[PDB]
Design a protein around this ligand. Structure first.
Ligand SMILES: CC(C)C[C@H](NC(=O)[C@H](Cc1ccccc1)NC(=O)c1cnccn1)B(O)O
Ligand SMILES: CC(C)C[C@H](NC(=O)[C@H](Cc1ccccc1)NC(=O)c1cnccn1)B(O)O
Ligand SMILES: CC(C)C[C@H](NC(=O)[C@H](Cc1ccccc1)NC(=O)c1cnccn1)B(O)O
Ligand SMILES: CC(C)C[C@H](NC(=O)[C@H](Cc1ccccc1)NC(=O)c1cnccn1)B(O)O
Ligand SMILES: CC(C)C[C@H](NC(=O)[C@H](Cc1ccccc1)NC(=O)c1cnccn1)B(O)O
Ligand SMILES: CC(C)C[C@H](NC(=O)[C@H](Cc1ccccc1)NC(=O)c1cnccn1)B(O)O
Ligand SMILES: CC(C)C[C@H](NC(=O)[C@H](Cc1ccccc1)NC(=O)c1cnccn1)B(O)O
Ligand SMILES: CC(C)C[C@H](NC(=O)[C@H](Cc1ccccc1)NC(=O)c1cnccn1)B(O)O
Ligand SMILES: CC(C)C[C@H](NC(=O)[C@H](Cc1ccccc1)NC(=O)c1cnccn1)B(O)O
Lengths: 178, 180, 180, 179, 180, 181, 178, 178, 178
């Protein structure tokens, strides 16, 4: 393809894209790309440009674990939109290497889901939703450097950030302007 | 109608899926028969697949409110919501036909309801409040300990009428008037 | 209506698919006719494709409950549940027209019901409880040994009326009043 | 049986509060005002709510009529129906002991599209609907509207015994026979 | 019906979406009440979401035609056409309940209508003729200058009843007869 | 009694809906009953219709021309397509319209595509030109126009206000309100 | 493909196309192409030809940030249509290098969106719609050189421009006629 | 593919095809092909064979602007059907190089569209429909050499042309018969 | 493709992905990859990274049998989500080589299915559901080292594990943190 050819040539320059909703297909693609790029050069940075409306928690936790366990530093770039799991994986970049493009918008909000089934199933899902939401807030508190009480308060409904507000809040480390 | 002849002899008739349409009919039927004869027993025929918890507790509270004792009779099926209404009749009453199928199980959500995890923490605290209320209601009408109801309604518990009498859902299995 | 003239002469009419709507009508019709004349026989016309086990056992228990003897008459078809209701009439009764099609077969699930294997262990213990009850019911009304009913309702067993009389589903094949 | 209830001056909400259901209840409220303006109209509520202008159509009519409104929650008063439950007369507003009162802020069922000037107005209206829902549920519950805003931030399901403590109802309705 | 008791006391009732079905009913109701008492006031209850311009101007012209003064009363909503019909009542009349929602906005096309650009030049000259007529009608009934109506109905203009009185849509906000 | 029954008792037929085979058959039944009740007293026809249907038009059209009673057509909010022809189809010295009525005249169309061989479509087009010429011939002896003027004007949608449907000849008077209000 | 082969050969001549609705897939493709072309030669111009009916704000802000942070000058070309985000990215080109083909049409209008959910969610969406619309108008005021009050007034409903009207208004710098 | 391979080999012989409805995807493909072929040889003719039922105005205006601004002469060929934007781009070819195959049919008609939205939106759409229809008629008057009053009169409804009638009217310059 | 190209290059580095629902298509792909990698080098480890929401029992039993009968050690990696057949194939890895990424979540639950048909068919399906559930619990008891009574009790409804809880329970042997 053309779009796959431009992405392959930027994969050669160690630039990968989270450019859609973080589902398992895009996550396993990025996890494969981070494993492929950490196998080629384990010392050069991987540039993850994030134009993402968010996505699955477990799909983005696959990416986040592959970002952390890569010996490369994952430079993340908020490009237009880093919402939900996009803001998570943005803030999950290497400290000092989390960038916002100056008109990127950052959406931190608590996870979406759905309960279904019997009341014993839903009691397990909500027990697990409390586990997922506590760990998602713990990591956003670890990434941004904010308290987990402030992360839980701000990420109660949609909490939008500009690039300057995300720099103050702690999702990104720099706003690049070249 | 044949239903009008049943209602004239003070027999309300559940019959259908317990929803907002069916609960509103039965509560209208229960209060009219309370106004006609408050001392003569209302009979409730139950052939329902159940469903609906607020429609359950609308019917449940009304048949507990009225001065007339409620004689619940399970016809072929009392499956959740309707099995709670079957146990909701007066003690010394609550018949069931010998091949009736009493089905008790914990409340469910029909389909997925979406939302934030704070929205779903409340929809789950409610479905546990619905579950605990369904087990508390089915404990003072069956004589069980609510924790036994919780262990038994963990899954679908289908009761035959002869073992819904042993369970406390009904009090007598209804003998046929002619052998046939 | 012509149905109202039949019901005035104490003929309930199955007619349609045995479901929760149709079972609730027939039970209302059976109890009204028990209240009108408890000693005069209710006639039941059956042209049904059957279906529904709790709707079957709702109709079945009610036509066994009433003091009036039930004269079941198969019109063109008594398939599945309706053939059990056809055998459910009083002995010395249970007619069928000469080209009626009695169809007995084991209970089924219409469509797939999903779930965990503990949920499906119970939905299968119920469909075997439904199967055993369908074979136990069709044994004391046909004089068979339930194990013969299980071997015969293993598949669809279509009975002509002349061989549903030999099977015990009906007791007489209904002779025409005029040759025509 | 509904006609026997209406003959004894019981309007019956029963269904989803929409333009069809609000128009029926307002017709029922005004007829019973014309029959006996001094005898109390009873309102049975088993509704899932919904609809804000259908709410405030029922709400204003049951506030307009000279007859005091005895609201009774049957199994559920949700969204618009819990506001109608609180909308009854003080010293009235019963609820059955296992009724489920559900108060929450107004929503849009589905997405309404448009320019951002169109959506600035559909959001100024849903905040006007929210503030009116909290102002209405404050003079009928005795709360401070800001407490109503903090409590209806999410779904607030009230049991009837704690909808009495909340001010939605005034008494939890005791059964006439134990059974 | 309770609607028949309202119509007996000369209250027409808008209630639903203004379309060809609803406009034809109200015009039939307006002319019957003109024939019954041409000197006694017709009351018009409006809980409508509006819609339809020729259905608007069918109702509008008829309530302007009849000799009886029209007392419009907004119930919960007078959106679009409904708000023009609300202003279309007689001066010294045109009540609205205190939490009524008057919504004025310019005419729209529900969905896309296709065609050649000569067809669409005419469908746009008509929607500007509909817009100018909606602003001319809502100017002699509100006392505004039509150009103010055009600037205000540029978008959705939701009016509370207390500020639809200041706008000229209604003349008085309807005080409750009992405090409650 | 319905309010429509009170209108029909005072000899007012009511078009109201989309002119189709269901609506045309009702109005022709209403026109002939009122001819049988009083053949000398005028039938009034209220028109709030979006039109449509040419044989349903000419079923209503011929019946309101057949009856001995003069037809007083009154446009309520809309007379479109077939309904504007029925509006002009009333008696001269009659044919009112309310002041904000919308008279819409345009040439006949096919709702959707009808398929077929080109010999089938040569006939479906000779018919839609026979329908067009008949719609322009009918709307010429009722408006006083020259059919060629009707063809040039109904080339597109011609929306007429009631004050300029009187100048066009569709109606004869714009109906003044009995009270100012 | 054929269409991908012609686009790849124009990518080699540093000519990229915004030829559809600006969604995240087309934006991440263009952002990848601008990053790929700025990596090859950081001094040659990139020609972005825009035949676009508009699109997502955040997708076009990804493109706009990639256009600005590229060391290349992004020559933009209004080709037929530059509505919504298409006019934005047209006017977002390098000053002196924003071109309109002589029969291109430019549609400047305020952003479209949709409100949904609870009234606390919609109060956040409208708070963010006011942020997006103010920054979209600020950048169109920066691009065209018009006041933000004139941008807000003209882009209230659809405001169409010919190539000559867009040259006077400031979206393009030249109307090329060869 | 096969179809893409035959089109690529005719792209090498500078023969491009407008063979479907002129939407933005086919227009951006042709605009890319004209830019690609004008970059290879700026002096050889491009043969645009048009079998088109018409299409979008702005998509065909993208093609028309790319045809004019190409230094190549765009020889256009009415092949079977040049309707709507197909007749426009046919008549938009280089004068002397607009060809009709002898059984091609030419359909000149005024543009189709759709009005929607509020009455202030429709007043803008119709203001712009009058702009589009005046410029479409001005260019068909420029192409065919007919007066704009005759173009507006004939292109009021569907106005069909054979190859001989389009030669007299001015859409094509020759009817090739080899 | 691009995604197939990154997966092929990780197939060359003996890294395969269970990245979706385990159906027969993904199972036959993985079974083919394990047979292909065991044919190339029968002594190097195969890294199976599992981001899976579960799937078919028989599809995952195909993978599990191909994992066991491969002479390679199948290192399994819980990457984000190892639910149902994903937790099974995770715990089915070589002992000492079952890894959880530190934010992977493990979902052990009893198998889902559906009964249908006549009561003699359902009596066979439930007889076979008892066979499948006993062998699925026997293997999870063999993998985790837990008793089959504890596996049957915990995997009665959804039983979620973090990476630390799955390490204690026995699904994984290490939590890798690099
Ligand atoms: C990152 C968090 C904080 C915010 C949002 N995340 C979620 O809501 C997503 C929802 C989603 C997205 C795509 C596919 C399936 C499910 N989280 C989950 O995947 C999820 C949902 N429920 C339970 C456990 N995880 B984001 O996707 O808007
Ligand atoms: C006695 C109790 C268990 C009644 C049972 N019914 C239910 O579980 C029903 C099923 C249902 C219906 C509609 C929407 C969601 C869920 N429970 C409810 O009515 C319900 C309603 N809202 C939230 C939670 N549960 B049973 O299945 O009839
Ligand atoms: C002789 C009779 C009992 C056999 C046939 N009836 C059935 O098996 C019917 C067919 C059916 C209907 C709805 C859902 C599932 C299955 N069985 C049931 O009613 C039924 C209901 N719930 C669980 C299991 N079976 B027949 O009546 O079609
Ligand atoms: C007591 C008050 C809050 C009533 C509430 N009702 C609503 O949320 C409903 C839900 C709804 C229904 C139809 C269309 C859009 C939205 N709100 C409205 O009626 C409504 C209508 N138009 C605009 C905004 N909201 B209930 O759901 O809490
Ligand atoms: C009072 C004015 C603002 C009327 C408002 N609605 C309209 O503009 C309505 C909405 C509508 C309905 C059907 C087809 C097209 C459009 N306008 C019309 O009735 C209409 C009908 N034909 C052509 C143009 N507009 B409102 O919703 O009543
Ligand atoms: C006053 C005359 C022109 C009535 C007009 N009616 C029509 O255009 C209608 C539209 C229509 C309806 C159904 C099927 C095909 C076409 N014309 C017809 O009734 C019609 C019916 N068969 C063939 C041709 N035209 B109206 O739309 O202007
Ligand atoms: C460019 C601006 C000024 C005008 C329009 N842009 C938008 O508002 C578009 C609307 C859109 C486009 C595609 C898919 C969904 C929504 N931008 C957005 O995506 C959007 C919508 N609401 C809030 C924030 N961003 B245009 O691109 O249609
Ligand atoms: C070429 C002209 C004169 C005639 C026709 N062209 C148009 O009017 C085309 C047809 C079309 C194609 C795709 C989508 C929508 C509409 N219309 C437009 O592109 C159009 C319509 N309204 C405003 C601006 N452009 B033809 O191409 O069908
Ligand atoms: C895997 C074990 C641990 C538990 C769950 N199993 C299942 O849900 C799956 C359901 C499924 C999934 C995908 C495609 C087809 C069937 N179990 C089965 O494959 C299955 C179902 N019925 C009989 C035998 N096996 B898990 O995958 O949700």
């Amino acid at each position: 393809s053309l779009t796959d050819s431009v992405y392959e040539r930027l994969l050669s320059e160690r630039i990968i894209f989270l450019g859609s909703e973080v589902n398992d297909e895009i996550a396993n693609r990025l996890c494969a790309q981070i494993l492929l790029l950490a196998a080629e050069d384990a010392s050069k940075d991987i540039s993850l440009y994030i134009n993402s409306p968010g996505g699955s928690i477990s799909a983005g936790m696959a990416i986040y674990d592959t970002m952390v366990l890569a010996p490369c530093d994952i430079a993340t770039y908020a490009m237009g939109m880093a919402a939900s799991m996009g803001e998570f994986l943005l803030a999950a970049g290497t400290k000092g290497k989390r960038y916002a493009l100056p008109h990127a918008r950052i959406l931190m909000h608590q996870p979406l889901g759905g309960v279904t089934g019997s009341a014993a199933d839903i009691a397990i899902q909500a027990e697990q939703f409390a586990v997922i939401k506590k760990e998602m807030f713990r990591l956003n508190a670890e990434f941004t450097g904010q308290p987990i009480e402030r992360i839980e308060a701000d990420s109660d409904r949609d909490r939008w950030f500009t690039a300057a507000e995300a720099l103050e809040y702690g999702f990104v480390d720099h706003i690049i302007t070249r | 109608n044949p239903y009008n002849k049943l209602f004239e002899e003070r027999i309300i008739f559940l019959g259908v899926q317990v929803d907002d349409a069916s609960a509103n009919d039965i509560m209208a039927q229960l209060l009219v028969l309370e106004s006609l004869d408050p001392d003569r027993d209302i009979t409730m025929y139950i052939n329902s697949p159940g469903g609906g918890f607020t429609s359950l507790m609308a019917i449940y509270d009304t048949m507990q409110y009225v001065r007339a004792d409620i004689q619940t009779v399970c016809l072929g099926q009392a499956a959740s919501a309707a099995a709670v209404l079957l146990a909701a009749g007066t003690p010394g009453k609550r018949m069931a036909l010998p091949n009736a199928r009493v089905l008790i199980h914990q409340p469910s959500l029909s389909g997925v309801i979406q939302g934030q995890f704070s929205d779903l923490e409340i929809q789950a605290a409610e479905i546990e409040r619905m579950r605990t209320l369904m087990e508390t209601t089915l404990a003072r009408h069956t004589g069980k300990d609510a924790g036994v109801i919780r262990k038994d309604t963990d899954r679908d518990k289908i009761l035959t009428a002869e073992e819904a009498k042993d369970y406390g859902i009904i009090d007598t299995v209804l003998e046929y008037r002619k052998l046939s």
